[PDB]
Write a protein that binds this ligand. Structure first.
Ligand SMILES: *[C@@H]1O[C@H](CO)[C@@H](O[C@@H]2O[C@H](CO)[C@@H](O[C@@H]3O[C@H](CO)[C@@H](O)[C@H](O)[C@@H]3O)[C@H](O)[C@H]2NC(C)=O)[C@H](O)[C@H]1NC(C)=O
Ligand SMILES: *[C@@H]1O[C@H](CO)[C@@H](O[C@@H]2O[C@H](CO)[C@@H](O)[C@H](O)[C@H]2NC(C)=O)[C@H](O)[C@H]1NC(C)=O
Ligand SMILES: *[C@@H]1O[C@H](CO)[C@@H](O[C@@H]2O[C@H](CO)[C@@H](O)[C@H](O)[C@H]2NC(C)=O)[C@H](O)[C@H]1NC(C)=O
Ligand code: NAG
Ligand code: NAG
Ligand code: NAG
Ligand code: NAG
Lengths: 96, 129, 439, 48, 48, 48, 48, 96
């Protein structure tokens, strides 16, 4: 079968970034801001946290777009603890 | 079928042919098999006014029910349903112009379905002891 | 040569070893309906294929010629097996299966048509059971194509696409009966396949012809018979292992299946068309463009059929060569013992037997196998009396007890020099050992 | 962990089990052994 | 006319190739038969 | 380009088929010759 | 060429079968040459 | 084919175009060793390729089987041997 597949032997890149209070401007540049080209394959870890022994699911949100401004559609895939909210809207994306 | 998920309704083989489907309306699952196709082995003798027909590897009931009704006599031979030939496998012939396979011959006098035995053992009644 | 004597290892003990050999004399008779293969059920394809004219006629004619060649070859092989076979009408294999301590029960099936298709021997039964797609296997597989089973047999798909294997004109049961008749022809008088003498005597004479004295042969007759049927049992049991002859037999079926599957796969090549399915093309396009696509499919499928036809001709040439070799071996190893050294297997060939196999014949070559050796000093000739030269017949001259004696070349057994085992010469050659005291 | 790798139009050898699940895959052009696997259409090619 | 003549050229060249292959196959059998005939001349007529 | 390349593909594939058939036919003769050579080794060199 | 299917596969398979036949034939010829040959270990062709 | 020669060998062009001759599974050196072993099997004991007798005696017996008396053969052994190796020399010289 011929389809949109990863290249075997190539490298995954862990683009997830975890901060606490401060955001580095270097996070919002290359190589983190990456070209889309044909597409991407994602292997996402479900970070399972517990609050009062209640399971909570978290993982990084990915945005797919071109210019990331409100005359252009940005696709956003954001988890909400079991609900995967996917939108494609003319978002005023933030600088950071 | 239990291999159909929610988004799947068609079953394919390695060659891209459809071999099964789940009905969208009734959710009932079916296998798809090809309709029968085959040949007729016709044995003809120049002196005859008809043909002896062999439907290879088909039983006469199947031929009559699902292929064609005929008025010719028929019987189930080892090779398949034979039409317009008398079943005379107990008889043997050493020469055969209409060889049907597996030691069977169509012999014309009507047509007869007989055994083909081209070679004999020379026999003596001397003692082996 | 120390003086006039050379050092030679002469056997002091021996056994009989059996070697299998499968020779392919037949192949599956593949028939192709070129019209059904190229065009299936589609009137629009059959119309266009009819403009190509004699292509399907040529394919059918060549395949018919090939299959007729196979049929004539099988008839010739059966005729070779049955030639000169005279059997007693009193012969009933249910009771007469061994003679002179040699057991042929496993090599003999039912004799005469009254027992039916049970003429296949235990040996041939054991050999046929391990090959599914014999003639009867193909017949049963094609019988099961309308049984309503959920199994999608590849043979049924091939037959529905016009690719079918037809049975041979003579069933393998008939060939097994012919081989059984040929085998029992050596068991009993008139011994029509054993040179007109009892089988054990023929074996003894064949061993003696290798340079083995008659004394040890007719004194060890029981041991020789035990070695012979032990070799036969070794062959039969070696069929259970990864046997090379069984692999060769299964290779015929596997190659036929591979060729048929590869030919069927041609029906799924697009050959540059939009699809390999005539259904899809005829449901996508009108006659003007559908014709353009169907023409590319017709050309690809006709080219594939022509390539398969050429391959089949080439393969059947080799099948004919193998069948000629098998008939020659039946004539010159089983029915008689032609003076050809390594024709009937390797080594000191004693005798050969033939059994039916799927798509061929299986020969059992029995050989004289030395077990232990003695190194002795031998003389290839002697100059005796009035300078008369003598040479040993199938043997050597040896010094035994300080005395010139003769021994066979294949078994160490010193015996007195006599005109029975000597070639006389009026003048002895040089380097012949001088022995004035002899005779 | 968010692992990202690029996609492209590539030929794969996909093996489905008896219940329709993709259990193994081969990127045909990724390596020599992958080429052998796709050529024979089997995960474990015969010795040769 | 070129388009039509090309289809005729291709059909006729394919037929010639098929006939050539058949002729090679048949002449192999002719050679085998001639070898048998020479062997029989040597070993049945000229000698026994 | 596909229209032209298809004509080149078909011509080159037909040539390969013809060469393949000729090679099969020639190797049959090679096998016959090798069988004759083995028979001669057995019946002229190793024995008479 | 990939849309023509198994054409190149058939070519390669046929040539592989031909070359395997040649290899088996060469092995058989070598076996015939060495069948039954016993030589003395004292044999030194530099002097004999 | 990779020596960088200015000569354009047709074999190199064929190999670059996918047409190559592969070596046989047994080298011709091995086959020549086999033929040498088969040949020396005739000179020396056990004469495993000469019916178990010396080569000269085998030649003499073969000539005698044609209808030649042994008396001339065993007195002309030197002449027969010289004729034999002269025939071998003629076979060797015929290749020129
Ligand atoms: C010479 O003539 C004698 C006498 O006719 C033959 O003796 C017979 O030999 C057969 C073997 O072929 C014996 O059959 C044996 O039967 C026993 C069971 O009793 C079985 O265990 C053996 O496996 C074998 O089947 C038979 O009994 C025997 N009969 C007599 C009266 O001795 C002998 O075979 C002839 N040939 C030679 C070379 O001696
Ligand atoms: C056939 O199966 C489909 C798939 O399960 C059924 O469609 C679902 O029905 C349930 C029950 O009402 C709904 O909650 C789902 O939203 C439907 N869609 C899917 C994708 O699950 C359908 O009802 C079945 N029909 C019959 C006649 O059995
Ligand atoms: C075709 O004829 C053969 C031969 O007469 C039939 O086979 C015999 O059938 C009778 C009756 O069942 C048996 O008693 C015999 O033992 C059978 N002989 C053999 C050799 O099998 C056969 O049944 C007939 N078939 C049909 C369909 O009429
Ligand atoms: C073979 O034997 C049967 C039975 O006696 C006989 O009917 C038939 O004519 C014989 N055929 C030949 C060719 O000997
Ligand atoms: C064998 O047949 C001949 C000729 O009919 C007869 O004379 C003889 O008695 C028979 N012998 C036996 C043992 O049946
Ligand atoms: C020959 O060998 C067998 C088994 O190796 C043995 O039983 C037999 O006694 C031996 N005979 C002689 C004469 O050595
Ligand atoms: C044919 O079908 C029957 C019944 O399903 C089965 O017993 C037999 O083994 C089958 N034979 C073949 C050759 O498929």
């Amino acid at each position: 079968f011929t389809g949109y597949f990863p290249k075997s032997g190539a490298n995954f890149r862990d683009l997830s970034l975890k901060g606490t209070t401060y955001l580095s401007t270097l996070w919002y540049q290359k190589p983190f801001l990456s070209d889309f080209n044909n597409g991407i394959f994602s292997r996402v870890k479900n970070t399972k946290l517990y609050v009062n022994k209640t399971l909570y699911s978290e993982f990084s949100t990915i945005v797919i777009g071109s210019v990331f401004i409100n005359n252009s559609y940005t696709i956003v895939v954001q988890p909400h603890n079991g609900v995967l909210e996917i939108t494609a809207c003319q978002y005023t994306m933030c600088e950071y | 079928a239990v291999y159909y998920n929610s988004w799947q309704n068609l079953l394919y083989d390695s060659n891209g042919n459809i071999i099964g489907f789940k009905d969208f309306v009734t959710n009932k699952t079916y296998n798809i098999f090809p309709c029968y196709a085959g040949r007729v082995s016709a044995a003809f003798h120049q002196n005859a006014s008809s043909l002896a027909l062999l439907y290879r590897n088909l039983k006469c009931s199947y031929v009559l029910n699902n292929i064609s009704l005929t008025t010719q006599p028929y019987f189930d031979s080892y090779l398949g349903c034979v039409f317009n030939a008398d079943n005379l496998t107990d008889y043997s012939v050493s020469s055969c112009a209409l060889r049907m396979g597996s030691g069977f011959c169509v012999d014309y006098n009507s047509y007869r379905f007989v055994t083909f035995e081209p070679f004999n053992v020379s026999f003596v009644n001397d003692s082996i002891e | 040569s120390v003086g006039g004597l050379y050092e030679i290892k002469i056997p002091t003990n021996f056994t009989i070893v059996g070697q299998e050999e499968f020779i392919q004399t037949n192949s599956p008779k593949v028939t192709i309906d070129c019209s059904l293969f190229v065009c299936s059920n589609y009137a629009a394809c059959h119309d266009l294929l009819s403009e190509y004219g004699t292509f399907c006629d040529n394919i059918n004619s060549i395949l018919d010629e090939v299959n007729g060649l196979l049929d004539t070859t099988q008839l010739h092989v059966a005729d070779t097996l049955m030639q000169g076979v005279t059997l007693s009408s009193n012969l009933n294999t249910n009771l007469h299966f061994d003679v002179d301590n040699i057991n042929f029960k496993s090599l003999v099936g039912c004799l005469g048509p009254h027992c039916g298709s049970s003429s296949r021997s235990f040996f041939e039964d054991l050999l046929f059971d391990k090959v599914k797609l014999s003639d009867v296997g193909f017949v049963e597989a094609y019988n099961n194509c309308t049984g309503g089973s959920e199994i999608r047999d590849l043979l049924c798909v091939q037959s529905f696409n016009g690719i079918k294997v037809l049975p041979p004109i003579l069933s393998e049961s008939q060939i097994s009966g012919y081989t059984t008749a040929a085998t029992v022809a050596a068991m009993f008088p008139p011994w029509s396949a054993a040179a007109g003498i009892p089988f054990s005597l023929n074996v003894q004479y064949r061993i003696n012809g290798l340079g083995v004295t008659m004394d040890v042969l007719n004194k060890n007759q029981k041991l020789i018979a035990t070695a012979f049927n032990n070799a036969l049992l070794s062959i039969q049991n070696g069929f259970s292992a990864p046997n090379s002859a069984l692999a060769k037999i299964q290779s015929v079926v596997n190659s036929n299946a591979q060729a048929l599957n590869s030919l069927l796969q041609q029906l799924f090549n697009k050959f540059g068309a939009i699809s390999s399915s005539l259904q899809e093309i005829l449901s996508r396009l009108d006659p003007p463009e559908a014709q353009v696509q169907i023409d590319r499919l017709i050309n690809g499928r006709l080219t594939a059929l022509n390539a398969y036809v050429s391959q089949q001709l080439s393969d059947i040439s080799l099948v004919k060569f193998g069948a000629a070799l098998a008939m020659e071996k039946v004539n010159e190893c089983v029915k008689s013992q032609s003076p050809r050294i390594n024709f009937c297997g390797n080594g000191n060939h004693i005798l050969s037997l033939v059994q039916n196999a799927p798509y061929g014949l299986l020969f059992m070559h029995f050989s004289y196998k030395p077990i232990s050796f003695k190194t002795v000093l031998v003389s290839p000739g002697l100059c005796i009396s009035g300078d008369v030269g003598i040479a040993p017949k199938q043997g050597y001259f040896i010094k035994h007890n300080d005395h010139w004696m003769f021994t066979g070349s294949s078994y160490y057994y010193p015996e007195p020099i006599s005109d029975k085992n000597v070639v006389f010469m009026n003048t002895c050659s040089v380097n012949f050992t001088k022995a004035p005291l002899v005779y | 962990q968010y692992w990202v790798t690029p996609l492209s139009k590539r030929q794969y050898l996909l093996k489905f089990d008896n219940r329709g699940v993709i259990t193994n895959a081969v990127d045909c052009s990724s390596s020599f052994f992958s080429e052998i696997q796709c050529k024979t259409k089997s995960l474990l090619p015969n010795t040769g």
